[PDB]
Design an enzyme around this catalytic site. Structure first.
Site, PDB file in Angstrom:
ATOM      1  N   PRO A  92      -9.844   4.599  -3.733  1.00 41.83           N
ATOM      2  CA  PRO A  92     -10.982   5.276  -3.858  1.00 41.83           C
ATOM      3  C   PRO A  92     -11.695   4.932  -2.622  1.00 41.83           C
ATOM      4  O   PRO A  92     -12.744   6.080  -2.705  1.00 41.83           O
ATOM      5  CB  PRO A  92     -11.570   4.701  -5.270  1.00 41.83           C
ATOM      6  CG  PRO A  92     -11.062   3.062  -5.054  1.00 41.83           C
ATOM      7  CD  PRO A  92      -9.646   3.249  -4.834  1.00 41.83           C
ATOM      8  N   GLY A  93     -11.462   4.370  -1.841  1.00 50.51           N
ATOM      9  CA  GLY A  93     -12.067   4.314  -0.356  1.00 50.51           C
ATOM     10  C   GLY A  93     -12.490   2.928  -0.185  1.00 50.51           C
ATOM     11  O   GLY A  93     -13.511   2.936   0.921  1.00 50.51           O
ATOM     12  N   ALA A  94     -12.295   1.875  -0.648  1.00 52.94           N
ATOM     13  CA  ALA A  94     -13.145   0.506  -0.166  1.00 52.94           C
ATOM     14  C   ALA A  94     -12.481   0.110   1.093  1.00 52.94           C
ATOM     15  O   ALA A  94     -13.391  -0.217   1.898  1.00 52.94           O
ATOM     16  CB  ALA A  94     -12.576  -0.368  -1.422  1.00 52.94           C
ATOM     17  N   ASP A 135      -0.014  13.816   1.189  1.00 53.38           N
ATOM     18  CA  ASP A 135       0.985  13.038   1.108  1.00 53.38           C
ATOM     19  C   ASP A 135       1.358  12.344   2.569  1.00 53.38           C
ATOM     20  O   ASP A 135       1.766  13.371   3.343  1.00 53.38           O
ATOM     21  CB  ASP A 135       2.340  13.546   0.644  1.00 53.38           C
ATOM     22  CG  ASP A 135       3.326  12.445   0.059  1.00 53.38           C
ATOM     23  OD1 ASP A 135       3.634  11.438   1.113  1.00 53.38           O
ATOM     24  OD2 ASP A 135       4.236  12.736  -0.634  1.00 53.38           O
ATOM     25  N   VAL A 136       1.176  11.125   2.832  1.00 51.65           N
ATOM     26  CA  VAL A 136       1.280  10.580   4.204  1.00 51.65           C
ATOM     27  C   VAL A 136       2.653  10.741   4.768  1.00 51.65           C
ATOM     28  O   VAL A 136       2.675  10.909   5.981  1.00 51.65           O
ATOM     29  CB  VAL A 136       0.892   9.285   4.112  1.00 51.65           C
ATOM     30  CG1 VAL A 136       1.089   8.526   5.640  1.00 51.65           C
ATOM     31  CG2 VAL A 136      -0.592   9.061   3.668  1.00 51.65           C
ATOM     32  N   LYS A 153       0.498  -2.952   3.575  1.00 48.53           N
ATOM     33  CA  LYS A 153       1.032  -3.918   2.283  1.00 48.53           C
ATOM     34  C   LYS A 153       2.329  -3.530   1.916  1.00 48.53           C
ATOM     35  O   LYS A 153       3.124  -2.467   2.191  1.00 48.53           O
ATOM     36  CB  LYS A 153       0.304  -3.142   1.204  1.00 48.53           C
ATOM     37  CG  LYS A 153       0.857  -2.502   0.098  1.00 48.53           C
ATOM     38  CD  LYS A 153       0.409  -2.582  -1.313  1.00 48.53           C
ATOM     39  CE  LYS A 153      -0.455  -1.416  -1.467  1.00 48.53           C
ATOM     40  NZ  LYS A 153      -1.635  -1.802  -2.896  1.00 48.53           N
ATOM     41  N   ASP A 177      -5.010  10.296   0.938  1.00 49.13           N
ATOM     42  CA  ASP A 177      -4.351   9.813  -0.275  1.00 49.13           C
ATOM     43  C   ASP A 177      -3.889  11.115  -0.976  1.00 49.13           C
ATOM     44  O   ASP A 177      -4.342  12.087  -0.706  1.00 49.13           O
ATOM     45  CB  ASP A 177      -5.451   9.027  -1.152  1.00 49.13           C
ATOM     46  CG  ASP A 177      -4.951   8.114  -2.020  1.00 49.13           C
ATOM     47  OD1 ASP A 177      -4.298   8.605  -3.289  1.00 49.13           O
ATOM     48  OD2 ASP A 177      -4.864   6.991  -1.970  1.00 49.13           O
TER      49      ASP A 177
HETATM   50  C1  LIG Z   1      -4.177   0.347  -4.050  1.00 50.64           C
HETATM   51  S1  LIG Z   1      -4.433   1.964  -3.983  1.00 50.64           S
HETATM   52  C2  LIG Z   1      -5.386   2.002  -2.195  1.00 50.64           C
HETATM   53  C3  LIG Z   1      -6.875   1.384  -2.562  1.00 50.64           C
HETATM   54  C4  LIG Z   1      -7.592   1.369  -1.043  1.00 50.64           C
HETATM   55  N1  LIG Z   1      -6.917   0.706   0.044  1.00 50.64           N
HETATM   56  C5  LIG Z   1      -8.801   1.011  -1.400  1.00 50.64           C
HETATM   57  O1  LIG Z   1      -9.385   0.337  -0.690  1.00 50.64           O
HETATM   58  O2  LIG Z   1      -9.607   1.838  -2.042  1.00 50.64           O
HETATM   59  C6  LIG Z   1      -2.740   2.740  -3.568  1.00 50.64           C
HETATM   60  C7  LIG Z   1      -2.803   4.146  -3.072  1.00 50.64           C
HETATM   61  O3  LIG Z   1      -1.929   4.625  -2.426  1.00 50.64           O
HETATM   62  C8  LIG Z   1      -1.746   5.906  -2.596  1.00 50.64           C
HETATM   63  N2  LIG Z   1      -0.577   6.425  -2.341  1.00 50.64           N
HETATM   64  C9  LIG Z   1       0.856   6.308  -2.786  1.00 50.64           C
HETATM   65  N3  LIG Z   1       1.889   6.802  -1.889  1.00 50.64           N
HETATM   66  C10 LIG Z   1       0.979   7.690  -1.207  1.00 50.64           C
HETATM   67  C11 LIG Z   1       1.732   8.688  -0.220  1.00 50.64           C
HETATM   68  N4  LIG Z   1       2.970   8.957  -0.066  1.00 50.64           N
HETATM   69  N5  LIG Z   1       0.564   9.496   0.541  1.00 50.64           N
HETATM   70  C12 LIG Z   1      -0.577   9.217   0.395  1.00 50.64           C
HETATM   71  N6  LIG Z   1      -1.122   8.143  -0.375  1.00 50.64           N
HETATM   72  C13 LIG Z   1      -0.066   7.426  -1.301  1.00 50.64           C
HETATM   73  C14 LIG Z   1      -1.940   6.009  -4.031  1.00 50.64           C
HETATM   74  O4  LIG Z   1      -2.358   7.340  -4.747  1.00 50.64           O
HETATM   75  C15 LIG Z   1      -3.136   5.097  -4.302  1.00 50.64           C
HETATM   76  O5  LIG Z   1      -4.344   5.619  -4.071  1.00 50.64           O
END
Ligand SMILES: C[S@@+](CC[C@H](N)C(=O)[O-])C[C@H]1O[C@@H](n2cnc3c(N)ncnc32)[C@H](O)[C@@H]1O
Length: 181
Positions: free
Chosen positions: A33-35, A79-80, A144, A62
Site C-alpha cells: 500500500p506504500g509504506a 507488472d514489474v 526480499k 505495483d
Molecule cells: C508485501 S506487499 C509490499 C508492501 C510494500 N513494500 C509496503 O511497504 O507497503 C507485496 C506486493 O508485491 C506486489 N507484486 C507482486 N508481484 C508483482 C509484480 N510482478 N509486479 C508488481 N508488483 C508485484 C503485490 O501486488 C503486493 O502489493
C-alpha cells in the site's frame, strides 16, 4: 505513521546500511500500500520538506492500486516484469535512472511452499535482469527473498554485478551495493 508495518524493516535496514539519503532517486517495486515508499520519500527528501538538502525522487510500482502520496509518483496497475513497465519507469525517473532499487514483491501465497519461494526468487532474478537499463552505476539493490538452495543463483549473480552483497535477516533481504554494473 505508516500504511503498513513493512516500514519498520526498511527503516532498520537504512539505519545500519545508509542506503537512502537526500537527492537519491528510488524505484520501489511491489510498492502497495506504500509504506516503503513513505520511508523512501522521507529519507531522500522527495517532498522537499527540508529546503537545506537535495531533493530526491520516489517512484513506486505495483499490480495493485496505490493511494497518492505527496512526493512520490506511482505506476499502478503495472507488472514489474512486463517490458512496457520498464519503459514507463525510464520515462518517469529523472535522468532515466534510479540510484536505489527496492523490492518487496511477493507472489500471492498458494500453500505450496517450495513453489512460492521459488517464484519469489524468480521475481528477484527478472528484476535483476532489467536492472542494467535502470540502475545508476554505483547504485543499490535491496530485495526480499528466501534463504536457501534455490537462492544461491540469485546471490551469485548479485556478487558478479555489485562490489558488495549482504544477506540481511530478522523473510530474507539481499542488499547489493556499488552496482558495476
Ligand atoms: C508485501 S506487499 C509490499 C508492501 C510494500 N513494500 C509496503 O511497504 O507497503 C507485496 C506486493 O508485491 C506486489 N507484486 C507482486 N508481484 C508483482 C509484480 N510482478 N509486479 C508488481 N508488483 C508485484 C503485490 O501486488 C503486493 O502489493
Amino acid at each position: 505513521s505508516y500504511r503498513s508495518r513493512s516500514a519498520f524493516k526498511l527503516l532498520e535496514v537504512n539505519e545500519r546500511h545508509q542506503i537512502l539519503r537526500p537527492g537519491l532517486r528510488v524505484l520501489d517495486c511491489g510498492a502497495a500500500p506504500g509504506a516503503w515508499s513513505q520511508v523512501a520519500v522521507q529519507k531522500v527528501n522527495a517532498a522537499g520538506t527540508d529546503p537545506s538538502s537535495p531533493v530526491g525522487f520516489v517512484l513506486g510500482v505495483d499490480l495493485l492500486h496505490i493511494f497518492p502520496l505527496e512526493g512520490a509518483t506511482f505506476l499502478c496497475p503495472a507488472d514489474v516484469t512486463d517490458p512496457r513497465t520498464s519503459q514507463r519507469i525510464l520515462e518517469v525517473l529523472p535522468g532515466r535512472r534510479a540510484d536505489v532499487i527496492l523490492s518487496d514483491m511477493a507472489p500471492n501465497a498458494t500453500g505450496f511452499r517450495d513453489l512460492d519461494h521459488d517464484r519469489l526468487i524468480s521475481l528477484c532474478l527478472t528484476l535483476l535482469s532489467v536492472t542494467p537499463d535502470i540502475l545508476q552505476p554505483g547504485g543499490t539493490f535491496l530485495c526480499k527473498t528466501w534463504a536457501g538452495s534455490q537462492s544461491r543463483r540469485l546471490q551469485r549473480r548479485l556478487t558478479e554485478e555489485f562490489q558488495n552483497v549482504r544477506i540481511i535477516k530478522p523473510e530474507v533481504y539481499f542488499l547489493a551495493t556499488q552496482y558495476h554494473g
